[PDB]
Amino acid sequence: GPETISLHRQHGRGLGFTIAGGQGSPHIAGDDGIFISKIIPDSAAKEDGRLAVGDRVLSVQGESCEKITHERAVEMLRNPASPIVLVVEHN
Template sequence: LSLAKRTGSDGIFIRMIAANSSAAIEGSLRVGDRLLSLDGESVTDLTPTAILERLRAIQGAVHITVSRDPQ
């Protein structure tokens, strides 16, 4: 999973999902999704690096809340 800030946008967005990763296998995340929370805790004010560190520290399943452009 690769995350990035978008110029002119607030928040952190999914830039890339690696093939055969947990996110790719599960299938609900999409490139371009904006991350809102991890296990109910807001990540809207965190950097991409801080979010990835939190994801790596989680043992087992994680609930990720995103928003998606309806296009």
């Protein structure tokens, strides 16, 4: 099921994950989803522990990540608001 994960920004470091996928650059053939591709150590994402590599990102700040480009997804994830609220599906 969809799970809500709020990550708090901290000065001088990033949220601690990268994404792959999107319309026009799918991570999996015929699946345009946005997926967590890496979780980087000693970060908000790592310490929080909920986010996992392979998670499908359904939303960022309530905005949908279905059928969007990679660029759009990165743009949503650079919103300087804090926390950044993700909704994801674990695999």
